[PDB]
Ligand SMILES: [Zn+2]
Ligand SMILES: [Zn+2]
């Protein structure tokens with residue numbers, strides 16, 4: 001079924017992200033690795049990320065949100081996963097604060113979370129975690145064909 005092919009394409013994209021994050025070769029021969037290495041390096045240096053939403057940074061965070069919704073690990077190889085999982089828990093009452101990830105200021109990540117709370121404006125706040133009758137809240141924001149388009153349709157003047 002196309003729902004399975006969609007979930008599988010997203011799972012391949014998540015495995016591409018984990019590979020690129022653990023991979024130490026800038027010249028790695030995988031197209032999956034090269035897509036995610038160039039995207040994570042772009043996202044780390046971009047100034048448009050949350051200035052109305054950069055299409056690279058926004059969709060990398062869409063994939064990290066989808067991954068964090070399935071993930072349970074306390075030291076996962078995905079870069080945004082754990083603090084996204086804290087932000088997802090805060091929408092369900094499993095975490096505290098909104099302008100902070102917890103009631104304590106010393107437990108915050110090295111990156112200022114004013115960026116993180118603005119990443120939370122690029123994705124819908126309720127729709128993604130809304131009450132559900134059957135498992136579909138995952139495929140809700142992705143397709144099997146957009147997995148390439150998000151990263152390969154590089155912006156330009158025309
Ligand atoms: Zn690699
Ligand atoms: Zn960007």
Ligand SMILES: [Zn+2]
Pocket residue numbers: 067068071072073076077078081082
């Ligand atoms: Zn994870």
